[PDB]
Amino acid sequence: SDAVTIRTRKVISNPLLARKQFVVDVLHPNRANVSKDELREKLAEVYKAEKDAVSVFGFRTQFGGGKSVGFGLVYNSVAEAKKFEPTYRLVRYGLAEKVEKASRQQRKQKKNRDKKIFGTGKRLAKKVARRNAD
C-alpha cells in the first residue's frame, strides 16, 4: 500500500507478434526503482494473462525520483513468448540459462586453426603419430 500506481500509456495490440506493447510508468513515493519482478507479477493481473508471459525493459526513473518510466510487453502464451523473446531476456526472466560457449577470441582462434585442416584430419592425426614413432 505504497500507492505505486501502475499504469500503461500508449498500449498497442500486436497480433503480428502475438503480444501487446505498452509503456509502463509507475509512481513510487519514498522508494527507488522498486524492481522488475513485482512489476511483472503486477502486470500479470493487470492484463489477466500470466506472470511468465510479461516482459518489461527500461525503467529509467526520472531525476528527483518517485517516477519510473519503462517499456512493457504481455504475450498471449509462454510458448510464443519464448519464440519472440530475445535470449538475453530469457536469462533475465529465469526461463533459460547462459549457454556456456567459449570466449569470442577463442572461437576465432579455433576457426583459424580449423581452417588449416582440409578434411577431418584423422589421417594426419595418425600420420604425425607414425612420423614421431618411427
Binding site: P29, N30, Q62, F63, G64, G65, G66, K67
Partner: protein, 185 residues
C-alpha cells in the same frame, strides 16, 4: 563514422578585457542576482545578441511578410511565455529594447528568492542546488531554470526535501541521535 554530435558555444567574451564601466556593471549584476561567474552574464548577453539580431534581420523585412510574421510572432510568443517580454509591448522593437535584467529576473535563483521562501538570492541558489525546490512535480537543481510564467504559482518546496517534509534531515538525525546517546533510550 557516425553522425556528429551537434554543439555550440553559449557565450561570448567582450572585446575589451578591462573596462572599468563594464566591470562595474558586471559585478553589480553578479552581486545583485547572486551569480557565480561573469560567464553567467556572458551567456545571457549571448542570448540577447542572438535574439536582437534575429529581430533586427526580421524587422529589415517589411510587414505582412509570411517569414516576418511567422518568425516574429514565434519569438514574440516565446518571450511572452518565458515572461521576459511583458503581456503588453509585444513588438520586435521592444524585443530590440530588451535588457540583461529581463532574463536575470526570470531565473529560478531569482524567482525562488522573490516569492518568499528563500530570504536571500544566495540562499535561493543553495536551496535549488541542494534540491529543495520542485517546480512542477519535478525537482530542479539548476539556478538558470528560467521559469516560463506557467510555473510561478507552483514554485514550492520539494515533496522530498526536509523543509517540504518526508525526511527530518541528515544533520538533524545525527544531532537527535547524539542527544539520545547522551540521554538514554
Amino acid at each position: 563514422p557516425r553522425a556528429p554530435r551537434t554543439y555550440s558555444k553559449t557565450y561570448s567574451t567582450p572585446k575589451r578585457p578591462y573596462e572599468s564601466s563594464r566591470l562595474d556593471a558586471e559585478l553589480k549584476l553578479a552581486g545583485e542576482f547572486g551569480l557565480k561567474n561573469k560567464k553567467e552574464i556572458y551567456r545571457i548577453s549571448f542570448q540577447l545578441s542572438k535574439i536582437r539580431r534575429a529581430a533586427r534581420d526580421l524587422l529589415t523585412r517589411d510587414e505582412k511578410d509570411p517569414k516576418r510574421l511567422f518568425e516574429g510572432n514565434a519569438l514574440i510568443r516565446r518571450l511572452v511565455r518565458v515572461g521576459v517580454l511583458s503581456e503588453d509591448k509585444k513588438k520586435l522593437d521592444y524585443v530590440l529594447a530588451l535588457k540583461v535584467e529581463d532574463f536575470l529576473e526570470r531565473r529560478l535563483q531569482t524567482q525562488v528568492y522573490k516569492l518568499g521562501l528563500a530570504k536571500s538570492v544566495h540562499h535561493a541558489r543553495v536551496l535549488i542546488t541542494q534540491r529543495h525546490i520542485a517546480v512542477g512535480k519535478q525537482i530542479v537543481n539548476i539556478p538558470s531554470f528560467m521559469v516560463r510564467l506557467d510555473s510561478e504559482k507552483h514554485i514550492d518546496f520539494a515533496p522530498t526535501s526536509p523543509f517540504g517534509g518526508a525526511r527530518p534531515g541528515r544533520v538533524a538525525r545525527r544531532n537527535a541521535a547524539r542527544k539520545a546517546e547522551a540521554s538514554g533510550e
